[PDB]
Amino acid sequence: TAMEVVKFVNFLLVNGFQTAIDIFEDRIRGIDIIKWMERYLRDKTVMIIVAI
Amino acid sequence: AEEGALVAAVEPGPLADGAAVRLALAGEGEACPLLGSPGAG
């Protein structure tokens, strides 16, 4: 999916949504991947988009 | 003894009549709903 995911993330960013993804938050993700994932999994207010 | 009795005709006396009651709805209309949002590139 990654190829289309890049386009989808660009489309969301154009619409002003604050999207979190590994390829673009790599520096923050690189510090601690598990912490990076939990930051969004814990938060009830963060919508999660699943690419099928 | 022909004066024993007489034949009698029976009628229903206190007859009455009335009109049927029908229901109707006053006025009609429809407010439009709202929809839509733009796509993006």
Nearest chain B residue to A16 by CA: give it. Answer: B40
Give yes or no for a contact between A29 and A49, defined as CB atoms under 8 angstroms apart.
no
Q: What is the resolution of this structure in A?
A: 3.0
The two tokens of residue A8 are 């989808």
The two tokens of residue A3 are 């190829």
Helices (H), A1-52: 2-14, 26-31, 33-42
Q: Is B41's CB within 8 Å of A15's CB?
A: no
Q: Is B41's CB within 8 Å of A11's CB?
A: yes
Give yes or no for a contact between B38 and A12, defined as CB atoms under 8 angstroms apart.
no
Way the structure was solved: cryo-EM
Alpha-carbon distances, residue B39 vs A16, A27, B4, B7, B18 (angstroms):
13, 32, 105, 95, 65
Distance from CA of B40 to the nearest CA of A (A): 7
Chains A, B: CB pairs < 8 Å: 5
Distance of CA B24 to the CA centre of its chain: 10
